[PDB]
Each structure stands twice: as structure tokens, then as C-alpha cells.
Write a protein that binds this ligand. Structure first.
Ligand SMILES: Nc1ncnc2c1ncn2[C@@H]1O[C@H](COP(=O)(O)OP(=O)(O)NP(=O)(O)O)[C@@H](O)[C@H]1O
Ligand SMILES: O=C(NOCCO)c1ccn2cncc2c1Nc1ccc(C2CC2)cc1F
Ligand SMILES: [Mg+2]
Length: 289
């Protein structure tokens, strides 16, 4: 069934960020509750049809680790992507209320991100391009899914930053990047969620004891690019987890681990075995179920 602007009714606003605003909406004809992302674009009707056309592959992006797609269309200077509503929100939100996310939980998250990337790569030859906590969504059934990945080449073009980057050193330095760059983003996202704040610059020994001005644009980019990468602090995290992120955060992208390797890493094998009530933990910390 086709989706269009007049068949929807706004319920509330889920949030917004840099180029997009997303609403919790009701699709009257079906009764379904959806998340409707609007992207304001001043663009000609030709490239619009290409964006809509390119977004149609979302209909075949079906995975427990990928946010579901309902449909896409254009309204009035807005492109609409309608998707599964995740009632847990994004991980940056849960991080706020949580303060820190337990390592065992991050184990489950890691599994989901890896399987999601792998799915998009193996089944669709798509790289994420934008892995970070707000693009990892969760729900009360304890599912962890990716969204906001680069299916439409043209949409990317029509949008081409913030005061904190999850971009790899190679992507910051030029055009010489690819799927490896997503690994870095994941690594950086996992520290931070683990620690309780964007891990650049790294905390002083005093800042560590407490847990257990904002940096200027160039100073932050220059750090990412030229300073040793961030590490999990010792003692408070398993050696396994430490190695896992160290492998994700190698500056040289060819030496950096790939999805293949990460999938059979000690930390993952260990997390696979662990029985974790994610649904329960999520609802307790953000007060839902
Ligand atoms: N499908 C969804 N279900 C529930 N909540 C959502 C969904 N999609 C987006 N959100 C919420 O909407 C917020 C903003 O989304 P978005 O417009 O993509 O920007 P962002 O990823 O948060 N930051 P940015 O990368 O700078 O644009 C997210 O932080 C989520 O909290
Ligand atoms: O939204 C995005 N950036 O976020 C910043 C805009 O606030 C982007 C960017 C480039 N893209 C290129 N193609 C799609 C998108 C795309 N959006 C998007 C992608 C996949 C889904 C899957 C159905 C769930 C939903 C989406 F909304
Ligand atoms: Mg997002």
C-alpha cells in the first residue's frame, strides 16, 4: 500500500537533528504507529524521483538488526521516510538516563551492530556511513537495530556536521575511505556508552576516579587524526572488551579489524553465551514496561 502525506496524523515529536526531524505518527488507513522522518530539501523534481527510487531498496532490507521500512515519498520541500517506531528510542537517549551502559549490555549491542553491518554489506553492498549512538535504536522486546544508513547515493549528495565526530581518521582526512570506517565509528560509540561521555579528549586520572570547556572543532579533529586513539580504562572492563575496541580503533584502516574478524572475537563469543535480560534492563533504566 502506498504512503502519502494526507493519510497521516501527528502524535508527538520523537526528536530532531541536523537536517531531519522525526515524528511519531499514526497512518490512518492501516492503523499502524510509525516513525516518520522528514528531510527538508530544496531540490528539483528529477533528483527527488531518484531519491524516492533509491530508497525503495529499503523494502528489501529485512533483518532483526535493521529498523523496518514502511515507505518513502515527497511532500512539500520535505522527503519522508516512514519506518518502524522503536519505543526504546536511540542509544544516546538511554545513555543519558543510564549514565553508563554495563559491559554485558554493550556485548549485546556490539553483536547487533556487527550483524547489522554484515547484513547490509553481504546482502546489499551498503555501508552504514553514520554509526553512532543516535542511529542505534532499541525497543521493549529487547531488539537492537540500525537506521539512517546510506542506501541512497543521491540523498547523501543532497545533504553534504556538528561539534563531535564519530568519523574515522581516514574519512576526516579525505576521500580514501570505505566500509572499514564504520568499524571505527562503532568502536568510538562503544567507549562513551561504556564510559558515560564522548571519549575525546580522554579523561585525566582524576576524572577516572570520580566516574569509577568543550573542545574546539579543529582541536578535536586534529586529536582524532594525530593523537593516539581512545582506550577503555583498565581494571573496570574485561581484557576481552578492551582488546575488542582497541581492534576497532586502530588508525590504519587496513590493520583495523574487519567484520569477519570481530564476529569471531573473544568478546563476542563470550557475549553470545551470556544470558542478558536486555528488555528488562532497558525498561528499568528508562522507565517503560
Ligand atoms: N525510528 C525511530 N523510532 C523512534 N525514535 C526515533 C526513530 N528515528 C529517530 N528517532 C529519534 O529521533 C532523533 C533524531 O533523529 P535524527 O533526525 O536521525 O538525528 P540524530 O541521529 O539524533 N543526530 P544527527 O546524526 O546529528 O542527525 C534520534 O535521536 C532518535 O531519538
Ligand atoms: O536519515 C539519514 N540521516 O540522518 C540525518 C538526518 O536527520 C539518512 C542519511 C542518508 N541516507 C541515505 N539513504 C537513506 C538515508 C538516511 N535515512 C534513512 C536510512 C535508512 C532508514 C532505514 C529504514 C530505517 C531510515 C532512514 F531515515
Ligand atoms: Mg538518527
Amino acid at each position: 500500500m502506498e504512503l502519502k502525506d494526507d493519510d497521516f496524523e501527528k502524535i508527538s515529536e520523537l526528536g530532531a537533528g541536523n537536517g531531519g526531524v522525526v515524528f511519531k505518527v499514526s497512518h490512518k488507513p492501516s492503523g499502524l504507529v510509525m516513525a516518520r522522518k522528514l528531510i527538508h530539501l530544496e531540490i528539483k523534481p528529477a533528483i527527488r524521483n531518484q531519491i524516492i527510487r533509491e530508497l525503495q531498496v529499503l523494502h528489501e532490507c529485512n533483518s532483526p538488526y535493521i529498523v523496518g521500512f514502511y515507505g518513502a515519498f515527497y511532500s512539500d520541500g520535505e522527503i519522508s521516510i516512514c519506518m518502524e517506531h522503536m519505543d526504546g528510542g536511540s542509544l544516546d537517549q538511554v545513555l543519558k538516563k543510564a549514565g553508563r551502559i554495563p559491559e554485558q549490555i554493550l556485548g549485546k549491542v556490539s553483536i547487533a551492530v556487527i550483524k547489522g553491518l554484515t547484513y547490509l554489506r553481504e546482502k546489499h553492498k551498503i555501508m552504514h556511513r553514520d554509526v553512532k549512538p543516535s542511529n542505534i535504536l532499541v525497543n521493549s522486546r529487547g531488539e537492537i537495530k540500525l537506521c539512517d544508513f546510506g542506501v541512497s547515493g543521491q540523498l547523501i549528495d543532497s545533504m553534504a556536521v556538528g561539534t563531535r565526530s564519530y568519523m574515522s581518521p581516514e574519512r576526516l582526512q579525505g576521500t580514501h575511505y570505505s566500509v572499514q570506517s564504520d568499524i571505527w565509528s562503532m568502536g568510538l560509540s562503544l567507549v562513551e556508552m561504556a564510559v558515560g561521555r564522548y571519549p575525546i579528549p580522554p579523561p585525566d586520572a582524576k576524572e577516572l576516579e570520580l566516574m569509577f570547556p568543550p573542545m574546539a572543532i579543529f582541536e578535536l579533529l586534529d586529536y582524532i587524526v594525530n593523537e593516539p586513539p581512545p582506550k577503555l580504562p583498565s581494571g573496570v572492563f574485561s581484557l576481552e572488551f578492551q582488546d575488542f575496541v582497541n581492534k576497532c580503533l586502530i588508525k590504519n584502516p587496513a590493520e583495523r579489524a574487519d567484520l569477519k574478524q570481530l564476529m569471531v572475537h573473544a568478546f563476542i563469543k563470550r557475549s553470545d553465551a551470556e544470558e542478558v535480560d536486555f528488555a528488562g534492563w532497558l525498561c528499568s533504566t528508562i522507565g517503560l514496561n
